[PDB]
Design a protein around this ligand. Structure first.
Ligand SMILES: Cc1cc(O)cc(C)c1NS(=O)(=O)c1ccccc1
Length: 194
């Protein structure tokens, strides 16, 4: 239906613009105009694809405490494919995905969901999802330490290895795994989406 399709393609683009201004209103427009199905899985797919979507607005929507938004956050994490990625590669991708909001409880929630998904995708690498979470923040801290020129006590490989001793349910992670994470960060800082 040529006319109906052209009108809907234009409304889709209007809904994207409205989302960037106010994510609740944007989603409402798309839903009420039958351009997006009001399900956690469809809204998450929309946000994951992110065509013409402001990443700060994506993150604001994903970090809300409401029922639907929590379910969207879960579904959005489910769309990330972390299989055979090292923790740093997985992180880069997730963090580029949307702009993490500044609130601590939002961060916690989002990184827990990340950690769960990384472990699911890579069974047996970490003994627990707590190991994964802790090492994720180890990696984030390393990114600041190494790459913020104001930090002058920069951890070398040996010290970073030592900082993580006993993390894996009492065991130490393979030295080669920690070195590879270290090298990845040292080589390429995380990119923030602004
Ligand atoms: C704040 C932020 C948000 C992003 O979407 C991506 C990045 C790399 C950052 N900065 S970040 O240093 O990796 C980071 C700091 C604190 C918590 C989580 C991540």
């Amino acid at each position: 239906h040529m006319s109906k399709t052209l009108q809907r393609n234009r409304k889709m683009a209007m809904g994207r613009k409205k989302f960037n201004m106010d994510p609740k209103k944007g989603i409402q427009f798309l839903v009420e105009n039958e351009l997006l199905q009001n399900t956690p899985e469809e809204i998450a797919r929309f946000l994951y694809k992110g065509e013409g979507l402001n990443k700060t607005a994506i993150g604001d929507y994903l970090g809300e405490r409401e029922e639907l938004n929590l379910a969207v956050l879960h579904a959005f994490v489910d769309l990330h494919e972390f299989t055979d990625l090292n923790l740093v590669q997985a992180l880069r991708q997730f963090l580029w995905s949307f702009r993490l909001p500044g609130e601590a409880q939002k961060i916690d929630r989002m990184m827990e969901a990340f950690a769960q998904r990384y472990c699911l995708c890579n069974p047996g690498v970490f003994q627990s999802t707590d190991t994964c979470y802790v090492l994720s923040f180890a990696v984030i801290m390393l990114n600041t330490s190494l790459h913020n020129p104001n930090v002058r006590d920069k951890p070398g490989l040996e010290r970073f290895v030592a900082m993580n001793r006993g993390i894996n349910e009492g065991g130490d992670l393979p030295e080669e795994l920690l070195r590879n994470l270290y090298d990845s960060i040292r080589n390429e800082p995380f990119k923030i989406p602004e």
